[model samples]
Target: PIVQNLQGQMVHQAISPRTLNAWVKVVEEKAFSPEVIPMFSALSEGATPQDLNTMLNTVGGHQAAMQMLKETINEEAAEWDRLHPVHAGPIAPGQMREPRGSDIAGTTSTLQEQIGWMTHNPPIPVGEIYKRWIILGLNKIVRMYSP
Candidate 1:
């Protein structure tokens, strides 16, 4: 039997300033344009989930917010592209296509297809993609700055 205290307990988590400051530093360094700061600040300073909706409205609308995020991603990518050139095209051809690749890679769908579906049929509000894309940006920043 489960303990009574554990049955309906909530995990109360506190946001640490150290973490927030670190993230803010990354935002300042990698976010490029300053426009993204509002969205980041709103969420960082303890707002309800619906705060995202209001933040977009304050800017213009959800579509406009995504446009902002898109621009940020483009600029960030362009900077990195200049520093490091990525080769286009497949390495081993059909080795990534079907049964052969499945045996090695073992993915139900290719990463390209998965990302395609996310953009076209994302279940969350389009804003969610913006949030996700920002994380991707941060990941790129870390890799680019790493030793």
Candidate 2:
């Protein structure tokens, strides 16, 4: 989600379709990779000017990091469902994409428990759990609001 544009400004963005194309261009130029670069043909793959401009920023040296970030995201979301267990809110009266949280009709603070320290794994370091939540929570809301 973190990228550096042509001028070397840092930015964060989601994985939209156009982002994939820009990533391929960076790979071709080899701005970062010196070792064997991985192929992205399988993932070869979107928005307004301001949106697309931000989207076009190069992923620079963080290509593998970004890919791992996405991989961890999938596993973390799955575990969140397994532990917290929330049902999906309806798109229509009864429509849902999949599952969504517990503590029905609760306040934000109370609902915080859904991600509270107690609910998360006790063995992991705080930094990692925080990273997981930040990555997971931010993307989840982004999807809910503007996606």
Candidate 3:
């Protein structure tokens, strides 16, 4: 069984600062922003079975969840969008539709743009990146417990 209290469990699992610091050095060298730190931090923090399995059971996996993602939950969270309402939509109509390519490749940008400055960094379906971190972290924890 996985720990219900994830923060404590991961305290033991967190990687050494020196290791993270050095790796961050390399990752930052290639990345556009401070993206690598949170990615690596998610690894160091790990997660729980109910955490991963339930999320998998809930939305299926990263592909579905990322597209389906929203809010600002901590995996064990305490929040939501301030400006956006429940079931947030793309800034304009036709903006949030499933990315389609006539044949394949090149279809998604999440905007039909009726108004407002279009945003991508904070994906229209916000918390997408965060959900990925939690789901993938729990996957790592699952791998550890798997036989």
> For each candidate, what TM-score against the reference?
0.24, 0.25, 0.21
lDDT of each: 0.40, 0.38, 0.33
Between candidates 2 and 3, name the one with more favorable TM-score.
2
Candidate 1 accuracy as TM-score: 0.24
What are the candidates' C-alpha RMSDs? 14.5, 15.8, 16.6
lDDT string for model 1 (104-136, tens) is 111334434433332333222223433444556
RMSD of 2: 15.8
lDDT of 3 by residue, 1-147 (tens): 112245443121223556545554544464323354365445433332222223333332334323332221233232222322345455566344332121011112222320111132332322233445454544544444345
> How many clashing residue pairs are found in candidate 1?
0
Best by lDDT: 1
**For model 2, how does the per-residue alpha-carbon lDDT over 21-99 read when each residue is reduced to its tens digit?**
6555755675334221232322221111222123324445555554554455456645655776545454575432222
Query: Candidate 2: misplaced stretches above 4 Å?
Result: 1-58, 86-147
**Alpha carbon lDDT at 40, candidate 3:** 44
Clashes of 3: 1
Local lDDT at 22 for model 2: 55
